[PDB]
Design an enzyme around this catalytic site. Structure first.
Site, PDB file in Angstrom:
ATOM      1  CG  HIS A  44      -1.920   1.084   1.274  1.00 45.42           C
ATOM      2  ND1 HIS A  44      -2.557   1.437   2.445  1.00 45.42           N
ATOM      3  CD2 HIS A  44      -2.407   1.912   0.318  1.00 45.42           C
ATOM      4  CE1 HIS A  44      -3.381   2.442   2.211  1.00 45.42           C
ATOM      5  NE2 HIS A  44      -3.309   2.751   0.928  1.00 45.42           N
ATOM      6  CG  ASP A  93      -0.491  -3.901   2.627  1.00 46.47           C
ATOM      7  OD1 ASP A  93       0.240  -3.472   1.707  1.00 46.47           O
ATOM      8  OD2 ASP A  93      -0.866  -3.209   3.600  1.00 46.47           O
ATOM      9  N   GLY A 186       1.588   6.501   9.277  1.00 46.25           N
ATOM     10  CA  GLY A 186       3.016   6.628   9.101  1.00 46.25           C
ATOM     11  C   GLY A 186       3.794   5.427   9.589  1.00 46.25           C
ATOM     12  CB  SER A 188       1.427   1.329   6.919  1.00 49.09           C
ATOM     13  OG  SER A 188       1.693   2.419   6.052  1.00 49.09           O
ATOM     14  N   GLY A 189       3.997  -0.525   6.790  1.00 46.09           N
ATOM     15  CA  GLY A 189       5.185  -1.059   6.177  1.00 46.09           C
ATOM     16  C   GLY A 189       6.257  -1.486   7.153  1.00 46.09           C
TER      17      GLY A 189
HETATM   18  O1  LIG Z   1       0.665   4.189   8.255  1.00 41.05           O
HETATM   19  N1  LIG Z   1      -0.520   3.763   8.168  1.00 41.05           N
HETATM   20  C1  LIG Z   1      -1.029   3.074   9.206  1.00 41.05           C
HETATM   21  C2  LIG Z   1      -2.320   2.567   9.180  1.00 41.05           C
HETATM   22  C3  LIG Z   1      -2.816   1.800  10.318  1.00 41.05           C
HETATM   23  C4  LIG Z   1      -3.851   2.225  11.152  1.00 41.05           C
HETATM   24  N2  LIG Z   1      -4.522   3.418  10.893  1.00 41.05           N
HETATM   25  C5  LIG Z   1      -5.859   3.590  10.745  1.00 41.05           C
HETATM   26  N3  LIG Z   1      -6.095   4.870  10.561  1.00 41.05           N
HETATM   27  N4  LIG Z   1      -4.862   5.482  10.594  1.00 41.05           N
HETATM   28  N5  LIG Z   1      -3.890   4.595  10.794  1.00 41.05           N
HETATM   29  C6  LIG Z   1      -4.261   1.441  12.241  1.00 41.05           C
HETATM   30  C7  LIG Z   1      -3.640   0.222  12.511  1.00 41.05           C
HETATM   31  C8  LIG Z   1      -2.619  -0.205  11.664  1.00 41.05           C
HETATM   32 CL1  LIG Z   1      -1.836  -1.706  11.958  1.00 41.05          CL
HETATM   33  C9  LIG Z   1      -2.209   0.574  10.588  1.00 41.05           C
HETATM   34  F1  LIG Z   1      -1.216   0.152   9.791  1.00 41.05           F
HETATM   35  C10 LIG Z   1      -3.074   2.803   8.033  1.00 41.05           C
HETATM   36  C11 LIG Z   1      -2.533   3.520   6.961  1.00 41.05           C
HETATM   37  C12 LIG Z   1      -1.231   3.996   7.052  1.00 41.05           C
HETATM   38  C13 LIG Z   1      -0.539   4.765   5.963  1.00 41.05           C
HETATM   39  C14 LIG Z   1      -1.019   4.399   4.574  1.00 41.05           C
HETATM   40  C15 LIG Z   1      -0.314   5.213   3.551  1.00 41.05           C
HETATM   41  C16 LIG Z   1       1.124   4.903   3.250  1.00 41.05           C
HETATM   42  C17 LIG Z   1       0.057   4.536   2.257  1.00 41.05           C
HETATM   43  N6  LIG Z   1      -0.566   6.207   6.117  1.00 41.05           N
HETATM   44  C18 LIG Z   1       0.531   7.013   6.249  1.00 41.05           C
HETATM   45  C19 LIG Z   1       0.059   8.307   6.342  1.00 41.05           C
HETATM   46  C20 LIG Z   1       0.862   9.501   6.520  1.00 41.05           C
HETATM   47  C21 LIG Z   1       0.244  10.627   7.060  1.00 41.05           C
HETATM   48  F2  LIG Z   1      -1.052  10.590   7.384  1.00 41.05           F
HETATM   49  C22 LIG Z   1       0.969  11.788   7.265  1.00 41.05           C
HETATM   50  N7  LIG Z   1       2.281  11.913   6.971  1.00 41.05           N
HETATM   51  C23 LIG Z   1       2.878  10.822   6.441  1.00 41.05           C
HETATM   52  C24 LIG Z   1       2.216   9.628   6.211  1.00 41.05           C
HETATM   53 CL2  LIG Z   1       3.136   8.356   5.529  1.00 41.05          CL
HETATM   54  C25 LIG Z   1      -1.338   8.145   6.245  1.00 41.05           C
HETATM   55  N8  LIG Z   1      -1.738   6.870   6.108  1.00 41.05           N
END
Ligand SMILES: [O-][n+]1cc(-c2c(-n3cnnn3)ccc(Cl)c2F)ccc1[C@@H](CC1CC1)n1cc(-c2c(F)cncc2Cl)cn1
Length: 236
Positions: A44, A93, A186, A188-189
């Protein structure tokens, strides 16, 4: 990371920060070193990434503020996204980054082992999620890498919390029933790292969840052991 605490230098040496440089340089996702030229991360992350040209992989980073114009990084030679990936909540993913050169391992940049063959029925009780993500739903990317210990949840319980999604054996969930500790935006991954017999294993890849650290809504992670054959095929 919600409800976590700051890490110290060298504490999570497989953790990397993946930066995009388009249209400006910023942290995009976490990732894990699994080989001298291989990072494991989430598919993702690459939504709207036009090519590997704009990516930079930084290892050995504790504070994002450490990264300046002469900080060394690894170029990305190839992004390998699982062929069945469509969206995080529907699974697959997972992505490999092949680096342009080999990481020389040091105290600050080390590989994490994949879940071991013959460990399929180990109960992991020492699992940690790490990252520079938000500390709450509307927050900001953190300077210092954060850590939180989070317990694994059975897939049966996880499915009951996410009745609108298909929670499969290729996912693993983690979180407290009362909430309060979780990955967030932030993170994720990055890794869900579990220690077993004093060896760290990359058990999950931080993937998705409903909100951040909410009651009875565990975070959902890619179940890395179910992708070991895929990883080995791509890295060989
Ligand atoms: O990182 N990340 C984490 C979760 C998550 C959640 N979440 C649910 N709602 N929020 N988080 C809950 C549990 C788990 Cl296990 C999860 F992995 C879901 C999505 C994301 C990522 C996707 C995106 C990279 C494709 N993302 C990063 C930002 C971002 C930002 F907003 C501001 N500056 C920099 C960044 Cl990179 C926004 N989205």
């Amino acid at each position: 990371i919600v409800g976590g605490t700051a890490s110290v230098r060298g504490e999570w040496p497989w953790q990397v920060t993946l930066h995009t440089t388009s249209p400006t340089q910023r942290h995009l996702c976490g990732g894990s070193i699994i080989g001298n030229q291989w990072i494991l991360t989430a598919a993702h992350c690459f939504y709207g990434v036009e090519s590997p040209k704009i990516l930079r992989v930084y290892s050995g980073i504790l504070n994002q503020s450490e990264i300046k114009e002469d900080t060394s990084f690894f170029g990305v030679q190839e992004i390998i996204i699982h062929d069945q990936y469509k969206m995080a909540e529907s699974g697959y993913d997972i992505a490999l980054l092949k680096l342009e050169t080999t990481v020389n391992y040091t105290d600050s940049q080390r590989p994490i082992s994949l879940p071991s063959k013959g460990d399929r029925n180990v109960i992991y009780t020492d699992c940690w999620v790490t990252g520079w993500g938000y500390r709450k739903l509307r927050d900001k990317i953190q300077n210092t890498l954060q850590k939180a210990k989070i317990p694994l949840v059975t897939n049966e319980e996880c499915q009951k919390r996410y009745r609108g999604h298909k929670i499969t054996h290729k996912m693993i969930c983690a979180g407290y029933r009362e909430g309060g500790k979780d990955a967030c935006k932030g993170d994720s991954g990055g890794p869900l790292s579990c220690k077993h017999n004093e060896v760290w294993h990359l058990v999950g890849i931080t993937s998705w969840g409903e909100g951040c650290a909410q009651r009875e809504r565990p975070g959902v992670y890619t179940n890395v052991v179910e992708y070991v054959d895929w990883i080995l095929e791509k890295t060989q």
